[PDB]
Design a protein around this ligand. Structure first.
Ligand SMILES: C[C@]1(CC(=O)O)C=CC(=O)O1
Ligand SMILES: C[C@]1(CC(=O)O)C=CC(=O)O1
Ligand SMILES: C[C@]1(CC(=O)O)C=CC(=O)O1
Lengths: 115, 108
């Protein structure tokens, strides 16, 4: 039941691609640092970051090429007000500064729960 | 630990946005009690902010995000072998025009 309410929070999913010049070894270390920095982030209920480890191409339906994605990020916000506390935060600004260092390109999707 | 595969879904060009939304819901309903599957989730893409604080990545129009969780490699195989799983994928062919799978790895 906690997980159900959690699933219906404001959620933004991000595709990350590392800077061209950064090694994979360093990129993985900087994802870990980025997660450490999320702790106590004002307004944020939850953050998750994962590497892309596999890119299977034998899909039953036609395969969508979106190029090489290195990691997937996700943020959960418990309310419109909490999202605003985040979006106003200096601490978020400093998180994004680290983001500019280890994230070369970023695609965010704002998602909508169906159930 | 937990195997996770995240999917970018694009609807078929023969289908409306609203039809697609309805098929997403049906697809979730079909997944209940699927052999080998720990969890399935499907959400629409409702917003495409481009006002990013690092360089914006363009991957085209993604309509939905799907995701599967499997407890173990053994459960994943039970799932792959399952007849009802195969029928669920046939429903996938109906409402998913193009698919991108990502097999993920945890960092913390
Ligand atoms: C929310 C945020 C902050 C940032 O990009 O630095 C954006 C992507 C991500 O993984 O973390
Ligand atoms: C869509 C979003 C959300 C956020 O601030 O994490 C806004 C800027 C950005 O880089 O990602
Ligand atoms: C896991 C799956 C199964 C399918 O292809 O129907 C693939 C994407 C999706 O949303 O559901």
């Amino acid at each position: 039941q906690f997980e159900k309410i959690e699933g219906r929070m404001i959620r933004i999913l991000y595709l990350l691609v590392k800077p061209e010049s950064m090694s994979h070894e360093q990129f993985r270390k900087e994802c870990v640092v980025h997660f450490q920095m999320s702790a106590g982030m004002p307004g944020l209920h939850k953050y998750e970051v994962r590497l892309v480890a596999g890119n299977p191409t034998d899909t039953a339906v036609p395969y969508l090429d979106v190029g090489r994605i290195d990691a997937i990020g996700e943020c959960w916000f418990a309310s419109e007000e909490q999202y605003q506390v985040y979006m106003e935060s200096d601490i978020r600004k400093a998180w994004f500064e680290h983001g500019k260092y280890f994230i070369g390109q970023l695609k965010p999707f704002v998602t909508e729960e169906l159930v």
